[PDB]
Structures are given as structure tokens and as C-alpha cells.
């Protein structure tokens with residue numbers, strides 16, 4: 001399948017070169033997989049989700065996304081126009097408030113929730129969790145991410161936007177999850193992206209068009225925008241049977257475009273998520 005005039009990041013993950021605008025992908029499109037977006041919520045009514053999104057848990061008064069961030073990230077996972085895995089099922093877990101902030105104890109609880117809740121859900125091709133969030137180093141946050149991964153979920157987390165080594169941030173610094181840095185449309189490491197030995201992969205993160213609240217769309221930048229490209233890619237690859245939740249991060253690194261990013265510090269991987277789709 002092919003989506004013409006796609007957002008640059010979708011085109012990028014289906015090309016060996018920057019500058020294209022068609023997203024090429026297998027029509028299965030993540031059907032039968034599930035992605036939990038652990039964030040500010042998801043505006044499930046947005047027409048771009050086509051009824052495939054639903055809130056499953058909130059840690060605040062409402063399940064509504066009063067911010068937009070979670071809706072944007074969910075859109076990069078699985079919206080029709082802006083999503084990597086256009087037929088995945090999206091589940092929203094609101095651990096962040098409407099200002100985009102959250103306490104680590106609540107974020108931990110939401111990870112634990114996903115590890116359990118997946119047993120209520122029918123996700124025959126597997127389960128992914130996208131965590132476009134984090135703060136300073138916390139062993140407890142890292143442990144929660146590790147548990148979620150161990151429970152059988154493909155965990156993708158943001159590297160952070162500190163232009164610093166991700167070792168000092170969580171859940172970025174948890175080794176066992178998939179830590180995602182950000183790139184721009186010219187294959188430079190995004191100016192804000194964290195780096196370091198703990199990164200597993202880069203995805204598109206600068207100027208990413210996706211869904212927003214009020215039934216809208218907008219372009220924003222962050223390792224939060226790179227993370228759902230990887231989460232969506234994992235769901236897509238799991239639906240194709242190419243990999244599993246436990247091995248998807250490694251598979252994505254194995255199959256990535258290698259050596260194509262600039263301003264990658266020595267010791268950080270030079271790997272950009274790639275679907276290797278051959279019609």
C-alpha cells in the first residue's frame with residue numbers, strides 16, 4: 001500500500017533516503033495488534049481514529065485529553081492519515097494531567113495497569129506500549145518499565161529532549177525497553193534529542209504532523225513524536241509476524257537504516273527506524 005503526500009516521518013521510515021513523501025507499507029497495517037498510549041489521554045472521538053481508539057484508564061478526574069500531547073502521539077501510532085500502523089487498536093491510559101505533567105508514582109501505576117489490563121483485551125498479534133514521557137533518573141520508574149516489558153509488552157520510551165546523555169533520565173535509561181531518540185527531515189539528530197549508549201534507535205521527531213484535540217491537527221517536535229513512530233512500527237512488524245514483543249526493539253535496530261544521521265556523538269547508535277517494505 002502507499003499513502004501519497006504523507007507526513008515526512010512516515011515517508012522516512014519506508015525509505016533508505018530522506019526527502020521522499022510517499023509512505024509505503026504492507027496493507028495489514030498493524031491489524032490485530034494493540035498499542036497502549038500512556039500519556040495525557042486520547043481524544044477517541046477524533047475522526048482520524050476511525051473508532052479504533054478508546055480510553056481504558058485515567059488517573060485524573062476525567063479521561064479526556066485536555067492537552068493534546070497524548071492525542072498527537074496516538075495519531076502517530078495509529079491514525080488513518082498520520083499513523084504508522086493504520087489498523088492497530090489504540091488504548092489510552094491517562095497518567096499525565098492536562099498540562100502534560102505527572103508524578104512518577106502515577107506513571108508507575110499506569111505501567112502496572114497496562115501489564116495487567118492486556119489480559120482483558122483481544123490482541124492476537126501482540127501488545128505495544130508507547131511512553132512519550134519521563135523526567136530525571138528514577139530506579140523505580142525504570143523498574144516499572146522493565147516489568148511492563150517482562151510482562152510481554154513491547155515498551156518504547158522517549159529518550160528525552162535535554163540534548164544530554166539519556167543515562168540521567170527515566171524511563172529512558174532502563175536498558176530492557178526500547179529507548180528512542182529523534183531525528184529531523186534532513187537526517188540530523190534533532191537539536192533537542194538526548195543521546196547516549198542507552199539509546200536503541202532513532203525515529204522522526206522534528207516537525208511531526210499528527211492529530212490534536214478539538215478534532216484538529218498540528219505539527220510539533222520532540223522525542224515524544226519519535227517514540228510512537230517506533231511503537232507503531234513494532235505493532236506493524238508484529239502483525240506481519242516478523243518479530244515479537246520481546247525481540248522487536250532488537251529487530252528494529254537490526255533492520256534500521258545505518259549510518260545515515262549527522263551529529264550523532266561517538267558511543268550513540270546511528271540507526272533510524274525502517275520498515276524494509278518491499279512490495
Ligand SMILES: [Mg+2]
Pocket residue numbers: 174175176177178179198199200249
Ligand atoms: Mg534498550
Ligand code: NA
Pocket residue numbers: 037038039073074130131132224227228
Ligand atoms: Na507515545
Ligand code: NA
Pocket residue numbers: 261262263264265270
Ligand atoms: Na553522525
